[PDB]
Design an enzyme around this catalytic site. Sequence first.
Site, PDB file in Angstrom:
ATOM      1  N   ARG A  99       0.764  -1.264   0.098  1.00 24.52           N
ATOM      2  CA  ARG A  99      -0.068   0.119  -0.266  1.00 24.52           C
ATOM      3  C   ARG A  99       0.928   1.154  -0.017  1.00 24.52           C
ATOM      4  NH1 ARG A  99      -5.535  -2.021   2.412  1.00 24.52           N
ATOM      5  NH2 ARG A  99      -5.931  -0.466   3.898  1.00 24.52           N
TER       6      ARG A  99
ATOM      7  N   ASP B   9     -19.716   6.706   0.212  1.00 23.19           N
ATOM      8  CA  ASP B   9     -19.934   5.954   1.647  1.00 23.19           C
ATOM      9  C   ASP B   9     -21.199   6.464   2.252  1.00 23.19           C
ATOM     10  OD1 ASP B   9     -17.399   4.385   1.306  1.00 23.19           O
ATOM     11  OD2 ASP B   9     -16.589   6.269   1.726  1.00 23.19           O
TER      12      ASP B   9
ATOM     13  N   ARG C 128     -24.433   5.528   0.400  1.00 28.52           N
ATOM     14  CA  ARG C 128     -24.402   4.093   0.269  1.00 28.52           C
ATOM     15  C   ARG C 128     -25.101   3.521   1.608  1.00 28.52           C
ATOM     16  NH1 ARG C 128     -18.530   3.031  -2.299  1.00 28.52           N
ATOM     17  NH2 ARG C 128     -19.099   2.247  -4.316  1.00 28.52           N
TER      18      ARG C 128
ATOM     19  N   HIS D 181     -12.026   6.831   3.519  1.00 29.84           N
ATOM     20  CA  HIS D 181     -12.601   6.332   2.457  1.00 29.84           C
ATOM     21  C   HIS D 181     -11.877   4.906   1.911  1.00 29.84           C
ATOM     22  CE1 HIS D 181     -15.119   5.747  -0.997  1.00 29.84           C
ATOM     23  NE2 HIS D 181     -13.949   5.881  -2.055  1.00 29.84           N
TER      24      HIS D 181
END
Lengths: 310, 310, 309, 309
Positions: free
Chosen positions: A89, A149, A152, A176
Amino acid sequence: FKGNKVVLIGNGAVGSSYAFSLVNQSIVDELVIIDLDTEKVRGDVMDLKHATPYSPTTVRVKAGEYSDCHDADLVVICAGAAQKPGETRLDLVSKNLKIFKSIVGEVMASKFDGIFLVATNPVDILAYATWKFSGLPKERVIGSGTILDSARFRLLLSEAFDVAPRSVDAQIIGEHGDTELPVWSHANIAGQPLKTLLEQRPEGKAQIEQIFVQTRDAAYDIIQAKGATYYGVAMGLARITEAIFRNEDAVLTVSALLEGEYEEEDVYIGVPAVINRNGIRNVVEIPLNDEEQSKFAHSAKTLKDIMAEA
Amino acid sequence: FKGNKVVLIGNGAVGSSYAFSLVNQSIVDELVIIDLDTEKVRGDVMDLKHATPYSPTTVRVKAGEYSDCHDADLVVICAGAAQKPGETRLDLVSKNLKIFKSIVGEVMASKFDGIFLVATNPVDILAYATWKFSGLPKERVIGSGTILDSARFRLLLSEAFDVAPRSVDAQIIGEHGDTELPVWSHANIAGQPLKTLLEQRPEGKAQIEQIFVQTRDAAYDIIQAKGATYYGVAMGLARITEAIFRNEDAVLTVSALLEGEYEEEDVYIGVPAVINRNGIRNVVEIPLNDEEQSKFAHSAKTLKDIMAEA
Amino acid sequence: FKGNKVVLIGNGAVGSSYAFSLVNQSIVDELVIIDLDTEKVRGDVMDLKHATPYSPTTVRVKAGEYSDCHDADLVVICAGAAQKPGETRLDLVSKNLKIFKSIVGEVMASKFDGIFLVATNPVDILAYATWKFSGLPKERVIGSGTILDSARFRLLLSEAFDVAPRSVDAQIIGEHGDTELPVWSHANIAGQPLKTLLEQRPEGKAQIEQIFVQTRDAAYDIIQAKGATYYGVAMGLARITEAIFRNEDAVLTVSALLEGEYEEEDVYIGVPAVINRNGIRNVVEIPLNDEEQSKFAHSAKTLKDIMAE
Amino acid sequence: FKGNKVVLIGNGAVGSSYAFSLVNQSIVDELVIIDLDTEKVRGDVMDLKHATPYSPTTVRVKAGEYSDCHDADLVVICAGAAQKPGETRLDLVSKNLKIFKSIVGEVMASKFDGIFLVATNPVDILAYATWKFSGLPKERVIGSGTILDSARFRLLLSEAFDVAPRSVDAQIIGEHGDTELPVWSHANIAGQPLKTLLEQRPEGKAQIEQIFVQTRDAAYDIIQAKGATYYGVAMGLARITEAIFRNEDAVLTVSALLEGEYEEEDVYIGVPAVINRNGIRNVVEIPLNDEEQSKFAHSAKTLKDIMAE
């Protein structure tokens, strides 16, 4: 007396979809699209222009280059690089930081003096980067953060309780990504306490969990089904665009710089914030319960640790 | 007291884009999506639902099957088959007629009693087929026809004369395809005679030609650039959808059955028509000059010859 | 396949403003206006029609009579009588009950089979009356209730906290009138507890009180200033009209019949309710704190006492 | 980065209706209202604010004074004086020229540097006056002109041909007043030649005449019916406001300064003109037939004669 000009940098599924949202919504009168795939741009600009005679009010769409940012009001950045096998990452962050240093550099060199809205993932890291790179005030650099988000979460609650999503007030805050959290201490329909009500149902605790899991893992689920996710993000970016150009003072969940709010500093992260024609006017500090305080702090730490590594 | 329900059959680039237009525009409150690629449908329905909390008013989106057409108000058909190598245009017509006999058959068997809007190419042939197959009155079967061609013509004129496309009144009529024609005898901006004005410019006759060529060949040009064309068609289908559900009596160029208008009969073809909640109220018969009469008759003959072969 | 048709009965300042809202918003494609003052109607209908070419989508406006309700979808009643000197509230109620018996009777005789939206004051009483007189299911008779009181409360809160009104979630419930109450247990901006925050300000209890007083007494204040109030009411009536015709399942505070909710029965009163193309789908029963439970019961009792008379 | 701010000067029926339109349409996020009748303003501003929670997007409304024009984008002038008995048109013109000299002076002294939209009658004269008094470029001073006359003509045509008004392309040009004229050489529905089609009907010439007479005399007819006209005007003022703030490059019939177009100079008069965020971008010069050329020249002469006096 210039009109309202948005420049989109990055014309993949998300950017192209956001461009179509703008043509449907007529939020601004001028859209410029920049991408290295100049054939896709040329094809999309034609296809979009042909829709514009049915737009509510005039929208002009054109292919552009960095110089066209000189008098842009909003630069929306969707361009970037996906994570590759064997990449950590940290590697993915470093790779997009290099891209953003270049893009932001070219934008600023055009004499751009507007607002940035960053959508590329990891959005909270890249919004922070765009702020640092651009030298602009924090009000003028906004990440899309949890704008989708939160939608949703509201969508799923509106299905669980069978009401309009516009009548559900519910929020996701934090990164996020993996470390986001639901704000159950506030989620309600006209005052109905949703978590408390769900707990009354059979296996109600399991339902609460699944509503959040499905929110958190929505992108993964859409990608497994159709390969990419784009409509939800495009619509969220349009919603922020609207708040700015219509000077709304609307509270939206976006990625914003904290300098003391929620006892956090020097980090961009998803929080409710008042949005208007000058960008983020202020972050709204809402009460969090113990579990939410715990999770939000952990999300902020997660983002700050990543950036520190970089 | 039921709400407004659209069922989309065919969820490729055009259908999916039309679905997103509906989520942006809130024309109707319920959208059902039917396609054999049920994974793409499931992924698109999730992605679209997540946009709906920012829709102007409630839009519910779901995956469906033919039985869900029972109480649908509008069935929009984008499904079909592209032409294959070695296939004649007659072959392409025969192949889509077989598909439409099946789709329309399944729709009617659900007890559907609404309006059809057909978008699949060749649209004038397939709108005629849907009319025959369904047994419905001609008012209730509409092809998208030249709804997008007219917009492309207006877009290009608005660039040539530098005004809002909404201030350009201009029309393409005839077949949506090779045999379409521009109605220069009427194209104007607030009374300005566009063809006459273009003829005054240097190589003005060449400009007039290129404006029409670029309108006629727009799909080909977009496909060469980005591989597919979809935004313009989605927006045109949304425009028709709006006229129906808002009962507008709006004149739009669509594919309609002629039974004597323009001295033609037993053919669907693109013409101005008044659209309202019951579908096509009437075809508008406008004056055509000699060249336009000639071309329109040839387009109608072309469509009727093809159908006769089939 | 019919379009969407609203008939307005009562073309005073409220009704005419509501008609203009409809011309601006294009919620429906047909509006019919009925009033005994047929010259004012003729004038308003001309002036309104002349605006319709700039309406987002077609709106047809015409002067009408009761028979035009036959295929109407929504009948909006703003007509009625004001209180006169030496008249008690009971007198005022009785006078309008007679007017409504006549209006609803004529409407029903046309074959109307849509939804009523009652705006005439006292709106909770007259909504109940319209339900009774019409014999329609409770879902299809809606009073405007606290649709405007709630907007007023949100407006004032949006000023005290400097944010978009659309970002203030706040409600007034109860009688549209002297016994209405604020739902401070719920009122919030993205979770910010507004009453709690106001109580931290100097003289914050006085500010809380004044926000509610200015909400409750808004019409009085506007009437004192310009002699009538109408824009707020028109916009609230347009918002309810939008929820019906766009089948929204939107929660709005309107006057609805209670049959057990909030432990009350046989009374119309202002409550959050889910609104869609079928009218009131259901009342929403929210938790109320002790103070709100007390005030809400008192409001319902007040309305039931006056009707029983 | 500033939002969009309109200041309305004159809060009569037209201005107050225009304010309500703005609350319905959310074209701009800030409206300031100025009028000498400060109690009516206080009342209207409260009533309007109470509607704003249901506005599509935030609209803030407040009572103001001339200094609030400093950073306004659009100043809309509806204020003025009506003609009195024993006053000539010249007297009426002179009286309003004095009022406008005062209003425009106070506005300019605030540091205003936006666009004027003049609505007060006689609008072509007062638009010209505002251009002169303000010293601004012609692009930034717009009169409402025939924005409503054109809508009236389209409305009546939409009724005679039974189609959406938005599908009727038709225009009134010239003075907003007795000398206005229909542009029948252009008026059409998707190319249908409306005058030609009307002439085929029995007594079709009488119908053509009556459509124009009813357009020209609409305000008179509405005033006779309900005593004032305002909804049509408000909606036309909102349409111009939309074209500016959404930078549309929309062609609208407004009152614009001619400097050679139509062979006329030094006169504001109703003409199609491209409107965008900078005001009038340019006048559009359309072909006129003999009758229209004659009537248009006569209208311009009428306006120039009266100004010269």
